[PDB]
Homo-oligomer: A and B are copies of this chain.
């Protein structure tokens, strides 16, 4: 769920998730997808595409199990959809941390009505 995801993001990036990623660019947030504006935003794009392949579980509501062992996210669900869901969230957290080098605050609350259409997943 959003709680797990949000905690993964903080553990990986060290930044407040809602603050720095709640509505970043054209893909991080609630406004669906959009042509990525940079690396960070591209992560969120891939993330939303990952979510679209889940069958049987809800990324918003459904919670799942995972541990933080030696500063590594380790998913631990028996449920295939919940496992995959956990892996979708782990992948974006790591991606966001890997692209902290070009994170642009001028995008934090970027106006999505300015974004171009996104290619289909």
Interface contact B14-A14, CB-CB below 8 Å? no
Interface contact B10-A10, CB-CB below 8 Å? yes
Q: How large is the interface on A (under 10, 10 to 19, 20 to 34, 35 or more residues)?
A: 10 to 19
Q: Does chain B have a CB within 8 A of A12? A: yes
Q: Does chain B have a CB within 8 A of A68? A: yes
Query: A22 → chain B, closest Cβ, in Å?
Result: 18
Q: Does chain B have a CB within 8 A of A35? A: no
B interface footprint on A68-91 (CB within 8 Å = 1, 0 otherwise): 110100000000000000000000
Residues of chain B within 8 A of A55, CB atoms compared: none
Q: How far is the CA of A12 from the CA of B13 in the complex (A)?
A: 12
**For residue A73, which residue of chain B has the nearest CB?**
B14
Q: How far is the CA of A13 from the CA of B69 in the complex (A)?
A: 8
Q: Does chain B have a CB within 8 A of A11? A: yes
B interface footprint on A1-22 (CB within 8 Å = 1, 0 otherwise): 0000001001111100000000
Q: How far is the CA of A21 from the CA of B3 in the complex (A)?
A: 20
13 of the cross-chain contacts (CB-CB < 8 Å) are A7-B14, A10-B10, A10-B11, A11-B11, A11-B14, A12-B71, A13-B68, A14-B67, A14-B68, A14-B69, A14-B71, A71-B71, A71-B97
